[PDB]
């Protein structure tokens, strides 16, 4: 699908769950987030901070679209742009993209 996420600050092509967790803990704000490519094929994770905890959400890359749960988008950038304006977890929007912080 679309590759426009490759230059986004929040996107990390090579970042483990553990590395992602240690990055997010340095940022005491709900809505801190990043996206990382998973070892599983055609899969990403959104790692985010909410209620003082780190959570991870799977995103499946399937054909010309990406899927999070039952929500479907044209691309990963469209998905992130959506959840920057609409809450992903309770009332938390994706708010603070983490670029190595």
């Amino acid at each position: 699908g679309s590759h426009m996420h490759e230059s986004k600050e929040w996107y990390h092509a090579s970042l483990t769950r553990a590395q992602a967790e240690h990055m997010l803990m340095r940022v005491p704000r709900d809505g801190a987030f990043l996206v990382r490519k998973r070892n599983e094929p055609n899969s990403y994770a959104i790692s985010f901070r909410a209620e003082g905890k780190i959570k991870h959400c799977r995103v499946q890359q399937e054909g010309q679209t990406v899927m999070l749960g039952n929500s479907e988008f044209d691309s990963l950038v469209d998905l992130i742009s959506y959840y920057e304006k609409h809450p992903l977890y309770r009332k938390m929007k994706l708010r603070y993209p983490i670029n190595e912080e």
């Binding site: 959570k55 991870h56 959400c57």
Partner: peptide
């Protein structure tokens, strides 16, 4: 949840 669902 290992992965939060949604």
């Amino acid at each position: 949840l290992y992965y939060w669902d949604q």
